[PDB]
Ligand binder design. Structure first.
Ligand SMILES: *[C@@H]1O[C@H](CO)[C@@H](O[C@@H]2O[C@H](CO)[C@@H](O[C@@H]3O[C@H](CO[C@H]4O[C@H](CO)[C@@H](O)[C@H](O)[C@@H]4O)[C@@H](O)[C@H](O[C@H]4O[C@H](CO)[C@@H](O)[C@H](O)[C@@H]4O)[C@@H]3O)[C@H](O)[C@H]2NC(C)=O)[C@H](O)[C@H]1NC(C)=O
Ligand SMILES: *[C@@H]1O[C@H](CO)[C@@H](O)[C@H](O)[C@H]1NC(C)=O
Ligand SMILES: *[C@@H]1O[C@H](CO)[C@@H](O)[C@H](O)[C@H]1NC(C)=O
Ligand SMILES: [Cl-]
Length: 603
């Protein structure tokens, strides 16, 4: 690329910047209760500042068994939802499954009534288990892709699907009107394609409710699936076409929120793609989000009610493609140990979600130009800039500027961009500093490190350490901001790359306490420490300091690369891991937060 000027005006807040992208998903002693999945969700929950909130999960009702011919056993569903709750995640609760073979036909009147009973009983159960306010946040959803006809020995016709929906809607209503239901979770192709999709909208708009006979049925949001076929802008372009058609065909759905809860670059999660392994995927993901913010949600004339975007990448990878599949983590099943164990590696895409999470509530004015020509996000180089207004003494003013350099699925190992970043209008404040974080394939690719090591199928302890050293972005220590609230940077960015510039004033109080610390075993001499940042109170963190106590209760530092990710795999050279651990936050001014409550561990 030729030289790019990126201008940010921190004195010019424009409108809200909603964090609409904080979702993932996957499709499966059940698979969801395995140690693999328990590690996976710890990693998903370890993205700082609720970077991922929703996990859209298929086949949740295959976790339920039936007794008689009528009660339900929820044990396996309890387990999975408890697992999500523990990681402070929410289910994208697809009402999908046959309750272990009980449900077979949704034109059978008896079964339609039984389905409603099941939905009400499960919603009431989890309202009881977690509280109404918590379950009210859950997106309940119809069966996935009803036009792809993926029903396991379940008969679902046009009419059956409508009856099934009414049972869903009425079931949730009986439990609480506060609970939210949407669908159909399909593509909405040009009619007569996607009949079950357009049929749901028509039924909700004008159709007869199966249970009550009234015209029209509740539909809290419309969820579609649009993939880009390797193009980022293509996702947004297809979405606008579908939203416009809905707007014009359904007057009542004018303000009904639209979700794209499978907005991936490419169909087929398990297909190996080199670009899925590294910062190429990461950068494209940011690019898609920047495109949706700037070209759809920001002051647009269209004003389509776009509410949620979900990357469907919580899947677990398999041999022989640990890195090359559409997944947030790279999974290594190390079978040559006694017993065999599982290791997860954080992929750049997961790290990039942590950079996105640093974005705040107001979008700042920013301009990207090339030799005087202004370029929108429909280009190789783009930007999202945000600001935070101080609320409590635990936080002060912040700005976060995320620059991407991405040519979608194409990586260019030679290609680089000369960028001039010009930031102005940072308001006066105490102890103003800036921190840069940078990702690219040369420096921050665990996959690149894996290949550098000869692609060991069963990596050694040291090989895992080396690969984990490439998870975090390269970061410069905090530098004091020059007076006048201005900064010029001339970085060289690769294709692909991400660059986050974080500018922060000094809060009056140090960070809050780390909470919910736990220790999960990996294998002999190794464990994962995971914690919550719910109460730290600010995003201006350099690292989380970890301490270890062997002897009695005297704690000593555990030396490590700085990281803000709420998880650390502890793998000392001595293998000595039994004892107590505590974690505290450290801010940009070297001020520590209070230590978490200690957690005991014994092999
Ligand atoms: C260490 O030990 C672990 C187990 O502890 C092994 O993990 C297994 O690895 C294999 C791959 O080597 C996994 O099998 C793969 O499953 C994929 C998905 O399977 C599901 O979906 C298909 C339909 O889409 C169903 O048929 C199936 O029942 C499952 O529901 C498949 O897509 C893969 O198929 C591909 O590869 C095979 C070759 O293996 C080809 O024949 C096919 O054409 C296709 O390309 C594949 O079968 C398996 O799921 C893993 N098991 C577990 C429990 O995790 C590791 O392999 C082992 N490590 C080493 C080095 O041996
Ligand atoms: C539910 O099923 C589990 C097996 O998954 C079993 O252990 C449990 O006892 C069952 N619960 C009831 C109430 O029957
Ligand atoms: C994106 O750019 C292409 C040309 O590269 C153009 O045809 C298309 O209209 C643009 N789309 C949007 C949504 O800006
Ligand atoms: Cl993809």
């Amino acid at each position: 690329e030729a030289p790019h000027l990126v201008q940010v005006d921190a004195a010019r807040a424009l409108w809200p910047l909603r964090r609409f992208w904080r979702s993932t998903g996957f499709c499966p002693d059940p698979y969801v209760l395995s140690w693999d999945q328990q590690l996976n969700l710890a990693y998903v929950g370890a993205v700082p500042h609720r970077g991922i909130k929703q996990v859209r999960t298929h086949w949740l009702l295959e976790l339920v068994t039936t007794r008689g011919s009528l009660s339900y056993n929820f044990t396996h569903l309890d387990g999975y939802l408890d697992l999500l709750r523990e990681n402070q995640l929410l289910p994208g609760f697809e009402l999908m499954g046959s309750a272990s073979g009980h449900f077979t036909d949704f034109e059978d009147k008896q079964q339609v009534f039984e389905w409603k009973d099941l939905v009400s009983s499960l919603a009431r159960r989890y309202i009881g288990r977690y509280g109404l306010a918590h379950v009210s946040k859950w997106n309940f959803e119809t069966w996935n892709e009803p036009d792809h006809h993926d029903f396991d020995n379940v008969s679902m016709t046009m009419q059956g699907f409508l009856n099934y929906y009414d049972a869903c809607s009425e079931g949730l209503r009986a439990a609480s009107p506060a609970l939210r239901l949407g669908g159909p979770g399909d593509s909405f192709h040009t009619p007569p394609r996607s009949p079950l999709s357009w049929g749901l909208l028509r039924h909700c708009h004008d159709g007869t409710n199966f249970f009550t006979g009234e015209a029209g049925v509740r539909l809290d949001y419309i969820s579609l699936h649009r993939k880009g076929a390797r193009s980022s802008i293509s996702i947004l372009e297809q979405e606008k076409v579908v939203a416009q058609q809905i707007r014009q065909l359904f007057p009542k759905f004018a303000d009904t929120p639209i979700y794209n809860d499978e907005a991936d670059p490419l169909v087929g999660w398990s297909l190996p793609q080199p670009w899925r392994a590294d910062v190429t995927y990461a950068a494209m993901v940011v690019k898609v989000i920047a495109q949706h913010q700037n070209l759809l949600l920001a002051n647009t004339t269209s004003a389509f009610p776009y509410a949620l975007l979900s990357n469907d990448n919580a899947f677990l990878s398999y041999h022989p493609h640990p890195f090359a599949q559409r997944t947030l983590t790279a999974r290594f099943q190390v079978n040559n140990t006694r017993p065999p164990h599982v290791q997860l590696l954080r992929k750049p895409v997961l790290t990039a979600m942590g950079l996105l999470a640093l974005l705040d509530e107001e979008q700042l004015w920013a301009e990207v130009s090339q030799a005087g020509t202004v370029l929108d996000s429909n280009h190789t180089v783009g930007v999202l800039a945000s600001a935070h207004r101080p609320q409590g003494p635990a936080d002060a003013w912040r700005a976060a500027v995320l620059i991407y350099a991405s040519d979608d699925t194409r990586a260019h190992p030679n290609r680089s961009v000369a960028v001039t970043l010009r930031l102005r209008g940072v308001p006066p404040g105490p102890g103003l500093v800036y921190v840069t974080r940078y990702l690219d394939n040369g420096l921050c690719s665990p996959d690149g490190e894996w290949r550098r090591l000869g692609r060991p199928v069963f990596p050694t302890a040291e090989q895992f350490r080396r690969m984990r050293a490439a998870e975090d972005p390269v970061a410069a220590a905090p530098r004091p901001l020059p007076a006048g609230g201005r900064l010029t940077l001339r970085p060289a960015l690769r294709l692909p790359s991400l660059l986050l510039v974080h500018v922060c004033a000094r809060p009056e109080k140090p960070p809050g306490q780390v909470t919910r610390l736990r220790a999960l075993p990996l294998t002999q001499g190794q464990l994962v420490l995971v914690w919550s940042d719910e109460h730290v109170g600010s995003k201006c963190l350099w690292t989380y300091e970890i301490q270890f106590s062997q002897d009695g209760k005297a704690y000593t530092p555990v030396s490590r690369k700085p990281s803000t990710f709420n998880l650390f795999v502890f793998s000392p050279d001595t293998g000595a891991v039994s004892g107590s651990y505590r974690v505290r936050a450290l801010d940009y001014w070297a001020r520590p937060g209070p230590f978490s409550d200690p957690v005991p561990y014994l092999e």
